Design a protein around this ligand. Structure first.
Ligand SMILES: [Mg+2]
Ligand SMILES: [Mg+2]
Ligand SMILES: [Mg+2]
Ligand SMILES: [Mg+2]
Ligand SMILES: [Mg+2]
Ligand SMILES: [Mg+2]
Ligand SMILES: [Mg+2]
Ligand SMILES: [Mg+2]
Ligand SMILES: [Mg+2]
Ligand SMILES: [Mg+2]
Ligand SMILES: [Mg+2]
Ligand SMILES: [Mg+2]
Ligand SMILES: [Mg+2]
Ligand SMILES: [Mg+2]
Ligand SMILES: [Mg+2]
Ligand SMILES: [Mg+2]
Ligand SMILES: [Mg+2]
Ligand SMILES: [Mg+2]
Ligand SMILES: [Mg+2]
Ligand SMILES: [Mg+2]
Ligand SMILES: [Mg+2]
Ligand SMILES: [Mg+2]
Ligand SMILES: [Mg+2]
Ligand SMILES: [Mg+2]
Ligand SMILES: [Mg+2]
Ligand SMILES: [Mg+2]
Ligand SMILES: [Mg+2]
Ligand SMILES: [Mg+2]
Ligand SMILES: [Mg+2]
Ligand SMILES: [Mg+2]
Ligand SMILES: [Mg+2]
Ligand SMILES: [Mg+2]
Ligand SMILES: [Mg+2]
Ligand SMILES: [Mg+2]
Ligand SMILES: [Mg+2]
Ligand SMILES: [Mg+2]
Ligand SMILES: [Mg+2]
Ligand SMILES: [Mg+2]
Ligand SMILES: [Mg+2]
Ligand SMILES: [Mg+2]
Ligand SMILES: [Mg+2]
Ligand SMILES: [Mg+2]
Ligand SMILES: [Mg+2]
Ligand SMILES: [Mg+2]
Lengths: 76, 58, 136, 116, 94
RNA sequence: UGCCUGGCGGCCGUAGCGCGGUGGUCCCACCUGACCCCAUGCCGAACUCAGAAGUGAAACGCCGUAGCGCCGAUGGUAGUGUGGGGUCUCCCCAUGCGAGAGUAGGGAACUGCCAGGCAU
RNA sequence: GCUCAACGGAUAAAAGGUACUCCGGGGAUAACAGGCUGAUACCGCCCAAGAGUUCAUAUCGACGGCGGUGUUUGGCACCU
RNA sequence: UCCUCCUAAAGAGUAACGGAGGAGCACGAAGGUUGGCUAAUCCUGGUCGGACAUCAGGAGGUUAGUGCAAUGGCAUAAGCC
RNA sequence: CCGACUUACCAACCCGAUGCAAACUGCGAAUACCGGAGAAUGUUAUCACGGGAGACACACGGCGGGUGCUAACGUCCGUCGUGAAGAGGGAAACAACCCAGACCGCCAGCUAAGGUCCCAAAGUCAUGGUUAAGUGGGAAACGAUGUGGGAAGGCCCAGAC
């Protein structure tokens, strides 16, 4: 009985979803994976985090020749 | 408005707060409480969802 | 004694085996044993039933086995509380799959097949039924 | 193999400019000919298509696929870009290196109307 | 050649299947090539006895559904995992 | 208005692999020199520039094939509450909810802009 | 100036014995002692190739298991 | 104290004594803006060289690699100059 | 020294097959989490602030982990619920098990599990019954010619056990 560890969970995963407004500066998703990427009007930080430069009702889709899940932006 | 008649036959005592607020919004407060709502798809779905602790008569 | 050469990890969860099973159909042999209910087949039990079927067939035909004691269960050696972490590795089994063929027989008559499968019922605590390979 | 290798080499830059959404001056040279365009920020519509396969450009240049013809095409395409009213582009070398025919044609575009 | 009396199952579903199994009825479906998919409810023990024959998955049978003969043949099967019940029996038109 | 050829959007394996055949008018690259602009942790091999003697071997493009991966059938399906129960290590009754698994069944693409050869 | 290493950090600076002991509380929480469950101490009950000269169906029984005495070994954590 | 996974009810997080592996940084180049390349593995041949050092065809493409324990990321590649 | 032949042996690896999961998801989920466009409903059940609290010691009926023995009036558990805060209502007696929400009396009506031989306050009906079990009213894997049946089958007044 010497192996009962786990992380101080960092509270990752999608936080501000498609259909929720983006206040000036707000993120869309915090994650340790690029599972949802910077498609149209979105960008990335330093430590595998991605904050969207564009506001409004966010758009979920799947694109890429690798069947990848992105995060794009609508016209709100 | 097409009011269709509704009746409570039991309460949301042993039941989830979902059912508690269901009876509360329907106005159903006690045993046999006899109410007069108006029917739409929303209320019809409510009927189907909690048709076990309530009883609707036409 | 059927037992893995190596396992993925030394212990594993106690596990769940509910609902319906997937070993419904017969795959390798002519004559099989069904277990509708639920339980566990120890490695000792599986080896014993294989040896007994060899005994009955007089080394005529072949034997087949589907489930394996790949899961080393940790029971607790007696007189130890729930605490002190998880228990200790003690033995190996596979659990009972509703519809599963456990042991298989071929080259011998149906009468000897049902005899040996009733003897599997008399070397196992599990509920039985006599099955054969299905036409398509 | 050159075409596939160059396309993979250029995927990052082409997708980068497509997603940036600034209309990009595109080039693709070949030893014998070359095609030069001006393409929309997303890439769904061109603006000016000028190449050494055009009648006048082909007959006013002695060799089709050479750096001098590339420079002439750069002059012509950037001046037609001024005629239509093209001012701001962000360069896309399309996976090549910025030297040779591409460098001379790009300098021609700079002289004849595109700011880069 | 077996001539089997079967009917049209108006409404299907899992609860329908449970009540039909209570009332001794198990389904099957007619299909094959371009024809319209129709599905039937069968007479259980009759079908079990008729498919106990060696020729059920080989020969050209005949189905009486709504007063008409239909020529079909076996394609596939599903079975009750741990009971002698054929969960499904499959028909390709002849 | 149509085939071939190139520069870029719509699908991102019903596109994608494979095998049977076709193109040098325009056309890609192979290819002549690489003394040059420019490169090698050795070679103009690679890139490239002044040229078109030839080129379709590899490649690109197009048709045929459902031989693979994929799509999804319809029956059928466990499980989620919800109220009822038991044969309570787990199974069943009235519904809403509903996966997969595969299968009889389809697809090699399809689509668009601009221009070069080709003729109204 | 932090192996203040327990590191949201009681101080700049800190180990033990009590059967000679004492106070306030607890069935929160343990033990003789005091219930549910039944893996197992241990007992009852599972065929039939065979030690059993062959032989199943006699000490009997190998490769191979369930209820239980609640009676033991245990599990839980309470009624006290 | 602080780390990699399932758990914990397909956002989240969720236990100690619910299985496995660790640190008290290092690189001023293992870096960045800007120029490049893309694995692992096995068959064939060759003086060394043997299954594998190195060279020369072919088969697969992230099954290679991550600076660590490892997950999730990553071809545009943070993987390799 | 390259070696010639075969041999109820093992299996790389691909095909015809068997697989598998807490630490794999080329599959896909459900209620819903997050939300964004509506009928009615809800004595405003949401937010901000200021005065004061308890507890940091919740149990049993409907789910998946370690557990444990696929045990428990079992647990750290994530949880709806009743109780807690509610007596009363049946349970042999035992809040939760099936309810139900009492503000107080009056020897007053439509009412929910337990419900309807006696104790006993509720039915000793008409149609089907069924059964030697006293089933109900507790021990399991095991079975064995008990027995309502129901369907299918094979010999058959040219002889069936
Ligand atoms: Mg299972
Ligand atoms: Mg159901
Ligand atoms: Mg060809
Ligand atoms: Mg060349
Ligand atoms: Mg060729
Ligand atoms: Mg399905
Ligand atoms: Mg499916
Ligand atoms: Mg195809
Ligand atoms: Mg093909
Ligand atoms: Mg501390
Ligand atoms: Mg004292
Ligand atoms: Mg004690
Ligand atoms: Mg006591
Ligand atoms: Mg007991
Ligand atoms: Mg035991
Ligand atoms: Mg004797
Ligand atoms: Mg005896
Ligand atoms: Mg023994
Ligand atoms: Mg006792
Ligand atoms: Mg005891
Ligand atoms: Mg306790
Ligand atoms: Mg206590
Ligand atoms: Mg989770
Ligand atoms: Mg959850
Ligand atoms: Mg770069
Ligand atoms: Mg070698
Ligand atoms: Mg690293
Ligand atoms: Mg980097
Ligand atoms: Mg699984
Ligand atoms: Mg898994
Ligand atoms: Mg509560
Ligand atoms: Mg607690
Ligand atoms: Mg449960
Ligand atoms: Mg699970
Ligand atoms: Mg549990
Ligand atoms: Mg408990
Ligand atoms: Mg329990
Ligand atoms: Mg609970
Ligand atoms: Mg009470
Ligand atoms: Mg009682
Ligand atoms: Mg009482
Ligand atoms: Mg009643
Ligand atoms: Mg009376
Ligand atoms: Mg006779």
């Amino acid at each position: 009985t010497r192996n009962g560890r786990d992380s101080e969970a960092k509270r990752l995963g999608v936080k501000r979803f498609g259909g929720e407004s983006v206040l000036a500066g707000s993120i869309i998703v915090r994650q340790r994976g690029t599972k949802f990427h910077a498609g149209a009007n979105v960008g990335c930080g330093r430590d595998h985090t991605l904050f969207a430069k564009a506001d409004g009702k966010v758009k979920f889709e799947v694109k890429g020749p690798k069947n990848r899940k992105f995060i794009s932006i609508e016209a709100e | 408005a097409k009011t269709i008649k509704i009746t409570q036959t039991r309460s949301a005592i042993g039941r989830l707060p979902k059912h508690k607020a269901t009876l509360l919004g329907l106005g159903l407060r006690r045993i046999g409480h006899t109410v007069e709502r108006e029917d739409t798809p929303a209320i019809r779905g409510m009927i189907n969802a909690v048709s076990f602790m309530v009883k609707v008569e036409e | 004694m059927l037992q893995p050469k190596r396992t993925k990890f030394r212990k594993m969860h106690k596990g769940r085996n509910r609902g319906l099973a997937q070993g419904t159909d017969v795959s390798f042999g002519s004559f099989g044993l069904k277990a509708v209910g639920r339980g566990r087949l120890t490695a000792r039990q599986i080896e014993a039933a294989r040896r007994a079927m060899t005994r009955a067939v007089k080394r005529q035909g072949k034997i087949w086995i589907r489930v394996f004691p790949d899961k080393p269960i940790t029971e607790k050696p007696l007189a130890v509380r729930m605490g002190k972490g998880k228990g200790n590795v003690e033995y190996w089994v596979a659990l009972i799959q509703p519809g599963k063929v456990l042991y298989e027989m071929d080259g011998v008559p149906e009468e000897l097949a049902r005899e040996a499968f009733k003897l599997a019922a008399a070397k196992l605590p599990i509920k039985t039924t006599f099955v054969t390979k299905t036409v398509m | 193999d050159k075409k596939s290798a160059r396309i993979r080499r250029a995927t990052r830059a082409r997708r980068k400019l497509q997603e940036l959404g600034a209309t990009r001056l595109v080039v693709h040279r070949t030893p014998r000919h070359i095609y030069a365009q001006v393409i929309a920020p997303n890439g769904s519509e061109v603006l000016v298509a000028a190449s050494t396969v055009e009648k006048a450009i082909a007959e006013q240049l002695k060799y089709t696929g050479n750096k001098d013809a590339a420079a002439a095409v750069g002059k012509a395409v950037a001046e037609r870009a001024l005629e239509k009213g093209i001012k701001d582009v962000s360069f896309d070398r399309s996976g090549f290196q910025y030297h040779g025919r591409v460098q001379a044609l790009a300098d021609a575009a700079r002289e004849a109307g595109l700011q880069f | 050649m077996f001539t089997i009396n079967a009917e049209v199952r108006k409404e299907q579903g899992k609860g329908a299947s449970r009540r039909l199994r209570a009332a001794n009825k198990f389904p099957a479906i007619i299909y094959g090539g371009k024809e319209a998919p129709l599905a039937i409810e069968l007479d259980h023990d009759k079908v079990m006895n008729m498919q106990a024959k060696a020729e059920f998955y080989s020969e050209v049978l005949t189905i009486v559904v709504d007063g008409k003969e239909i020529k079909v043949k076996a394609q596939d099967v599903q079975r009750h995992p741990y009971k002698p019940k054929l969960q499904h029996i499959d028909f390709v038109r002849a």
